[model samples]
Target: KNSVSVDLPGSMKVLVSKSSNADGKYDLIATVDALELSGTSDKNNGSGVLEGVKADASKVKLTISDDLGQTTLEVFKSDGSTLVYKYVYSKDKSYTWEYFNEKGEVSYKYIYRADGTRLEYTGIKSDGSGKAKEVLKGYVLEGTLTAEKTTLVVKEGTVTLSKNISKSGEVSVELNDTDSSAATKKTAAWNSGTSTLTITVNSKKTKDLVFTSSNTITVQQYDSNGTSLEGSAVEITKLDEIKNALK
Candidate 1:
């Protein structure tokens, strides 16, 4: 009793059929348009065409909190009874819009902004860990940062400062001056409940450090007196190298 239709003229990728007998081996339990293919005797083995459509505009949702932002879509075989695939998207974080397949693994994810800005990633590759590293790490961004005005480089996979080790809760970012001078250290607070990474210098500073955006890090330089200034140096870099350090 499942069907799909479109007024337009382009052909749709309709889900024809699946085998009714579930065994280790996959036989042609269902039939396709006979004229569409041939090898031996010709006969239609299944009844009715079953198709599915990937979610429409209302498929995805946004929320102020972490939970209640997930939608699940299930696909049954042509027999209209056997479950074949499942696509799940969770808005735990918008930029990390993840989808899972019948195998119970993430398939792809994407997000587009009104300002013509967005990003997408499909988690399928022989590389095994290609898309996994794209997810945000360190409660902050997992990458490197360099100051244009200052002679310092901060590393976060895994930033303002390179970390030698990572663990739960409070930790320090180890920063070494690019000019070969002594480095400065800064401590940051990671709060999961609020989804914020709090960091400050000797003066005092605070801003929204939510790790819920595309594959880019945003930062504003703060002076020793806690004054926020326009971007001069604090830029993100070396994402390729950081991807190797993902856990």
Candidate 2:
């Protein structure tokens, strides 16, 4: 149920034709990408070979499920006896494509998941003896959020805790040596009318916290709980203070 036009190259000409059957299905045979094509009923039922030079063209067959949601394309050798490759695709954004050996066994299979994941399974051995030892997998994450009055705020935020005098807030934490991977988590809390925002972290301490807001908020290390640990001669808000006290 489609019309196709072809343009000849100089005096070079190619065959182009189409035929329909009684079931309102059609077969398209052209000496083009699909070397020899023929089928009926729907796009799913059509099959054609890919034109190749020197050797004969490869044989191809297309099949579709009854619901018309899944389709498979099979490519065979020129002799039309051995399958070269097969590809299966679904409407759910998933697909599996594989190449086969002369013995009709899969040599490699490439699979794609609907959730943005992919896997490549190798069946053939490196030394041409048997199957592979390991398989490779990949994954990706993507998302989009849309809002009318969306407020874009940095990962940091501040809330005033007191108005007049600077209130002190202390956060104590223990970290491992070479604390490169110490902690990534941080939090902030404040009470109404409080000018200082208390930021806490799992690690002993970090440099002054940075945040984006209309009004700037200052931060400092102060001891809220007067109780001092055995190592802390003075309030231990920074890692250096803890080390000096312990020494």
Candidate 3:
């Protein structure tokens, strides 16, 4: 679970917290930003500087899952190292890094979420330095790639809708009051590259509504598609020079 709140005092501040339950205790995650509003005349307009701790005295819990096993982490501040709890988990599993807290639970863990779905190619090493071939890869579908955001534009009396795809393929969508009022469900499909989606507001009516930028949009990535291309990658670009009126 996660939560966020804004606080206004002599200054303005925002706090965000997250929590996860595994064992007996619920891990408490928190982040706070303190800003001085009086410092600037345009307090409402200017971006507030953020500088603070993410995991304070609050109990923090981090969960990671992998092919080998699932791990739980808990962390706390250590002065010079004190009672701070001490214990070792199960068998040795390779990890980028790991940390422990006073409660002796794995607190901060740096684990890579790799699904091994991306394509990989190797490059020949010409240098006599004696290094292995460098590997390059393209888009890997580890999760949902394009995040979907619905946009509505009303022209004359028509409405057009589009979805914004995320780099990782996370999908979130929105619709205006007019479109949402439609009693039936509207279906849409994504293009091959997974970048764009043309939403049909009304299959029966098309020419009347046009997509416009005035409609508000909320964006969120639904699935984590992993990463894009790695190393030197080539993007096939094409330009159309042909003109046609009624193809």
In order, how many clashes per candidate?
Answer: 8, 5, 22
| Model 3 error, position 12 (Å) | 43
Q: What is the lDDT of residue 139 in candidate 3?
A: 17
lDDT, candidates in the order shown: 0.33, 0.40, 0.26
Selected candidate, larger lDDT, 1 vs 3: 1
Candidate 2 CA-lDDT value: 0.40
Q: In candidate 2, which residue ranges exceed 4 Å CA deviation?
A: 1-20, 23-25, 28-36, 42-55, 125-247
Q: Which segments of candidate 1 are over 4 A away from where they belong?
A: 1-82, 87-185, 189-198, 206-215, 230-237, 240-247
Candidate 1 per-residue C-alpha lDDT over 52-75 given as tens digits, one digit per residue, 9 for 90 to 100: 332331122111112224433344
Candidates 1 and 2, the one with greater TM-score? 2
Of candidate 1, the 10-residue stretch with the lowest lDDT total is 35-44
TM-score of each: 0.31, 0.37, 0.18
Worst 10 residues of 3 by lDDT: 238-247
Error of 3 at 169 (Å): 13
- The best candidate in terms of TM-score: 2
In the order shown, the candidates' Cα RMSDs to the true structure are: 14.5, 19.0, 22.6
Runs of candidate 3 with Cα error greater than 4 angstroms are 1-68, 73-75, 79-172, 175-198, 201-247
